[PDB]
């Protein structure tokens, strides 16, 4: 019986900087870092044992049953994901990106032709461009009704300029239930927004 | 010197059976363990077995016994590898990257990691690309990509020669098995509605190419 | 003892080349590979029922190979040549050899699988010679004395 | 301390351990660490059972 943890595992900081990262295990720990959709690589192995070929500014801080990962001079390269790894079980890791670039998102709608619903299919998408947190809430509804269940969202990588985010909500609908209201409203309330923001669009 | 490789992406159809390859020969590897890991998309890493190139004795987890299968087929100088796995009965939801990785010590650390091969199940087998445009009324503009199998399909504008804040939004899959992502490029506020711009995707697994020219 | 609450499971050999899946051994020149699959399965729970049997013996076949890669890649190959006349062979089972299964990393339940076989032949000799540690007598020893060296004049 | 050891034999098995020496303490088990599955896990006897093959 082997327990493993994590930090809070949602932590962000700036260029140049030092973080640590928090692993309780009884066994041996191998820290990997791995990069999007790429095979991760091997860090620090042991604990504190610092691998060939491994950047000084990596520190292992075995004390009791807590582990630490301080890395200096946070540097852009270093925005992966960190995870620690003992004989079989693997924790589900960390989020590491920049931090604090603040921006206001931008709930964008664009109503679509009337030929997909010849082939007897709706498809309209609410769009959330340029923010950051990721965190928000972003719901469809029929003149301003309950929505739910029948959105697939999704969001791009971190955007490299600005350090931003951007936010995708495509809606499905039937034939009746998508021209029966012609207007809709998309309110998506931030923390990058200071009040909460509601859409309105035209078909024409 | 190790270069540690894995084969490319195979596709299968649900209750098929799968079969991704992992070779090793730049150092002494007639003594080393050879793990297999695979990683639900968006999602931690999973073990999937350890085999012995000495013995080819295999070792599986409680769920993936019976259906997986570990094998070595070794060279006659023992110096040339390659490993093979194989998932037979392929389930619904089982689409991930299969990693082979190397055993350094009795630390259970991994050094060497393969390239890692994609593998996706699903019904609606292949098919070309459709892709139906969005009518603007800054600001955005879209060309949804539905109605496709299997993944990847390229995305440019203008022959590639605008792409102007482009956000393409990965390929998100649907009940249906026919994958559909939304790609917008910034564009100003007041001078939409009237300008005119052109989306041409490519569907390498089906060969298909259709040009779009949206429209207000 | 050994693990805290888990019952105990027994499978026989997952795959592998025949000398892990199978029990290799030898007898008076030629080899033998005797499946032993039936004294390899079991479970064991809470112990509350007793199930009694007969004496019944149990009967393994074993199949017989000639051409034995006995070591992986060092051995030379061989080619045993058949033995004149019934042979028996009588010997003890002294050790076995297992090997554990890896856990899940979602919820285990409460049990743990042993499988037989496997290893390479070091451990045939490791389970022996593991009371016997190797040392060198350093037998010059320094210690004060009140003795000095009456030194001639 | 002895001299040196006792009789071993080179007896080769795989599955088995045939015809080696018995522990008079009880049903022992070895290994590496019986935490780490990669080593294996080697179980003695104190009764041997009779083999007939
Ligand atoms: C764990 O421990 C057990 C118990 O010791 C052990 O089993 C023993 O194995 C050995 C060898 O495997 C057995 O020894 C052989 O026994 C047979 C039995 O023959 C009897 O019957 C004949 C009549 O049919 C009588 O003539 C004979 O005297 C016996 O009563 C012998 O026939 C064998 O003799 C051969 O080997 C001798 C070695 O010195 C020679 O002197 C003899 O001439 C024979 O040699 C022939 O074959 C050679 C090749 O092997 C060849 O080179 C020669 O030129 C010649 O052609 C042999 O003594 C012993 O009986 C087993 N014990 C019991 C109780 O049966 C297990 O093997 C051990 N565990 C493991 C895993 O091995
Ligand atoms: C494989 O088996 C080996 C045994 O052969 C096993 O070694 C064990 O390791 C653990 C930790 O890795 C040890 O636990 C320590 O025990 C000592 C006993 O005094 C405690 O003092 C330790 O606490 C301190 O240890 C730190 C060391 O720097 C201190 O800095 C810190 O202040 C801690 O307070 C710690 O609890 C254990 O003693 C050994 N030996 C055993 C268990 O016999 C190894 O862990 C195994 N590998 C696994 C399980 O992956
Ligand atoms: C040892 O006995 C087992 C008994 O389970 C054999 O396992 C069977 O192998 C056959 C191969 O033709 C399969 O079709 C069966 O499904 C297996 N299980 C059962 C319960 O029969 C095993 O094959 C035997 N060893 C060898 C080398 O044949
Ligand atoms: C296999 O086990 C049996 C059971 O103990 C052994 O029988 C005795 O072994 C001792 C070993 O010191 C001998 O001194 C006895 O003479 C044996 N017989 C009896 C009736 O006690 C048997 O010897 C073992 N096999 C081998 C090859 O030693
Ligand atoms: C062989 O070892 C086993 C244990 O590994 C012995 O069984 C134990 O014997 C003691 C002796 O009083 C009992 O207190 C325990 O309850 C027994 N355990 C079990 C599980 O039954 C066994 O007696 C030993 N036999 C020989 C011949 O040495
Ligand atoms: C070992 O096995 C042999 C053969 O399997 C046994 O020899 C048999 O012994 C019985 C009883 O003495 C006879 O009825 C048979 O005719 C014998 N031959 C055969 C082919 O069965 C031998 O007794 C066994 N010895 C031990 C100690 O188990
Ligand atoms: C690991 O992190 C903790 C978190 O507060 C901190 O005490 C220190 O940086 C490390 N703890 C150690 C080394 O014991
Ligand atoms: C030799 O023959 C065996 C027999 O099956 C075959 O498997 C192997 O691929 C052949 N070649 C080598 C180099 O062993
Ligand atoms: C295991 O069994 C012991 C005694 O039978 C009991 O005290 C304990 O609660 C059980 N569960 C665990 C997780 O130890
Ligand atoms: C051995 O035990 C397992 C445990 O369930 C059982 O399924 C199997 O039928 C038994 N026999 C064989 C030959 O595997
Ligand atoms: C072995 O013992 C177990 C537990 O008592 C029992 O379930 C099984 O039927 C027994 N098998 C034989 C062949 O005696």
């Known amino acids: 019986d082997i327990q493993m943890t994590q930090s809070p595992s949602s932590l962000s900081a700036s260029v140049g900087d030092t973080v640590t990262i928090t692993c309780q295990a009884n066994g041996y720990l191998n820290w990997y870092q791995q990069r999007r959709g790429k095979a991760p690589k091997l860090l620090i192995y042991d604990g504190s044992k610092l691998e060939r070929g491994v950047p000084s500014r990596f520190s292992g801080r075995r004390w009791g049953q807590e582990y630490n990962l301080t890395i200096n001079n946070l540097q852009p390269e270093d925005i992966a994901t960190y995870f620690c790894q003992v004989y079989e079980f693997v924790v589900p890791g960390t989020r590491l990106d920049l931090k604090r670039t603040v921006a206001a998102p931008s709930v964008f709608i664009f109503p679509p032709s009337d030929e997909q619903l010849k082939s007897g299919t709706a498809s309209v998408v609410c769009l959330l461009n340029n923010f950051y947190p990721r965190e928000a809430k972003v719901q469809w509804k029929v003149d301003n009704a309950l929505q739910s269940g029948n959105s697939q969202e999704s969001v791009t990588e971190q955007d490299s300029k600005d350090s931003t985010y951007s936010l995708s909500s495509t809606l499905t609908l039937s034939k009746a239930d998508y021209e029966k209201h012609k207007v809709y409203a998309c309110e998506v309330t931030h923390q990058g927004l200071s009040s909460p923001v509601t859409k309105s669009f035209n078909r024409g | 010197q190790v270069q540690l490789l894995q084969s490319g992406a195979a596709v299968t159809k649900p209750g098929a059976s799968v079969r991704v390859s992992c070779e090793a020969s730049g150092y002494n590897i007639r003594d080393y363990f050879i793990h297999w890991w695979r990683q639900a998309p968006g999602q931690g890493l999973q073990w999937v077995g350890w085999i012995n190139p000495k013995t080819g004795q295999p070792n599986n987890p409680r769920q993936f016994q019976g259906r997986v299968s570990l094998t070595r087929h070794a060279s006659w100088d023992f110096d040339t590898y390659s490993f093979y796995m194989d998932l037979k009965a392929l389930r619904s939801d089982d689409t991930a990257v299969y990693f082979c990785?190397?055993?350094?010590?009795?630390?259970?650390?991994?050094?060497?990691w393969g390239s890692g091969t994609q593998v996706t199940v699903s019904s609606a087998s292949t098919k070309g690309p459709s892709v139906f445009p969005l009518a603007p009324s800054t600001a955005a503009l879209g060309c949804l990509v539905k109605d496709y199998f299997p993944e990847p399909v390229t995305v440019s504008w203008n022959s590639g020669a605008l792409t102007s804040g482009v956000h393409t939004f990965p390929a998100v899959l649907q009940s249906s098995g026919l994958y559909s992502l939304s790609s917008v490029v910034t564009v100003p506020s007041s001078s939409l509605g009237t300008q005119t711009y052109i989306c041409n995707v490519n569907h390498k697994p089906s060969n298909t190419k259709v040009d779009k020219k949206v429209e207000p | 003892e050994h693990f805290p609450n888990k019952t105990i499971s027994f499978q026989p050999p997952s795959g592998g080349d025949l000398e892990i899946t199978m029990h290799h051994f030898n007898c008076r020149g030629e080899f033998f590979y005797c499946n032993t699959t039936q004294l390899f399965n079991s479970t064991w729970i809470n112990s509350t029922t007793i199930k009694e049997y007969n004496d019944t013996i149990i009967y393994l076949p074993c199949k017989i190979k000639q051409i034995i890669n006995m070591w992986q890649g060092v051995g030379q190959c061989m080619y045993a040549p058949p033995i004149r006349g019934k042979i028996n062979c009588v010997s003890n089972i002294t050790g076995i050899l297992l090997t554990r299964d890896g856990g899940d990393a979602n919820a285990t339940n409460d049990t743990e699988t042993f499988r037989p076989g496997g290893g390479n032949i070091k451990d045939n000799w490791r389970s022996e010679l593991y009371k016997y540690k190797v040392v060198q007598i350093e037998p010059l020893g320094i210690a004060p004395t009140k003795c000095k060296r009456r030194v001639v004049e | 301390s002895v001299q040196c050891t006792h009789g071993i034999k080179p007896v080769v098995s795989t599955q088995l351990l045939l015809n080696g020496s018995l522990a008079e303490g009880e049903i022992i088990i070895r290994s590496e660490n019986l935490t780490n599955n990669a080593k294996t896990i080697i179980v003695h006897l104190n009764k041997s059972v009779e083999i007939n093959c």
């Open positions: 990785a190397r055993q350094r010590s009795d630390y259970w650390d991994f050094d060497v």
